[PDB]
Design a protein around this ligand. Structure first.
Ligand SMILES: [Ca+2]
Length: 156
């Protein structure tokens, strides 16, 4: 199963509180940039998992505007910055055994980095710039391979 791990886009520093910080114009722009790149890669997203935080959901909105995404999305509490990478890993393994062919995961630091390591043996937490995407091929036994990583700058 193809897993695409994405860090939410650039977000405003100030808001009533952290969970509600909106995306910035640039954050939107770059998120659409990465979305179109994926579209050009013949990427077909079957399932979507997103953090409950506004910046994650908005990144999803923006992406969904350029890439054909599922009508629904699953808002996961464990995708927040302090999310339990173990439960995220298990959720992904579940979908893998379910038959799901591909999933797009939109989250935050430091979770995104740890998630890749947790899923892929021998890998250290990679560095994620905003809107950057990590590709991981996960098998039924929870064994994942870190394929590549793409960021708005390596396209820009
Ligand atoms: Ca469009």
């Amino acid at each position: 199963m193809q897993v695409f791990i994405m860090r939410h886009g650039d977000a405003a520093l100030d808001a009533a509180s952290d969970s509600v910080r909106p995306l910035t114009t640039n954050g939107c722009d770059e998120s659409r940039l990465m979305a179109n790149w994926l579209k050009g890669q013949k990427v077909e997203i079957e399932r979507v998992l997103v953090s409950p935080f506004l910046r994650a959901e908005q990144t999803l909105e923006e992406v969904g505007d350029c890439l054909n995404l599922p009508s629904s999305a699953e808002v996961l509490p464990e995708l927040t910055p302090c999310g339990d990478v173990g439960l995220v890993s298990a959720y992904l393994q579940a979908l893998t055994n379910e038959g799901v062919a591909s999933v797009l995961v939109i989250s935050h630091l430091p979770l995104v980095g740890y998630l890749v390591a947790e899923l892929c043996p021998g890998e250290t937490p990679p560095m994620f710039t905003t809107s950057a995407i990590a590709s991981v091929t996960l098998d039924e036994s929870g064994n994942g391979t870190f394929n590549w990583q793409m960021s708005p700058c390596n396209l820009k």
